[PDB]
Design a protein around this nucleic acid. Structure first.
Length: 48
RNA sequence: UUUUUUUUUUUUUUUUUUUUUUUUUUUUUUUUUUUUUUUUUUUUUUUUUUUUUUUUUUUUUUUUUUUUUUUUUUUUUUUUUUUU
């Protein structure tokens, strides 16, 4: 559910969304793993 | 035709209970660390006219039958007798 909301937030940000870390947007913190540690940990499991 | 029966007799106020006694702020975490140009192949080579047959020969008028012969009037019964 949290991931689904984030994708809508990413679409809402605009053309500056991919360069969020470069501009150091405060919205970036909500995107970082830590708000969804369980799925991210599973995601890194298959990724590796 | 008709012959019975066909008023009434109880009871019918009330007696409880009905306030309250707990809890009810907070103590975590929450940036990032990879990868992400390309390396082949990619014209064509065959074949592709024609050779047969394709008139006709039979039959195809007719021969029977086809009027008629019966029957075809009628002959019974057909008021009433209780009760109410």
């Amino acid at each position: 559910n949290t991931i689904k909301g984030l994708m809508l937030l990413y679409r809402e940000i605009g053309p500056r969304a991919p360069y969020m870390v470069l501009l150091e947007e405060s919205i970036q913190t909500k995107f970082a793993p830590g708000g969804y540690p369980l799925l991210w940990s599973f995601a890194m499991g298959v990724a590796t």
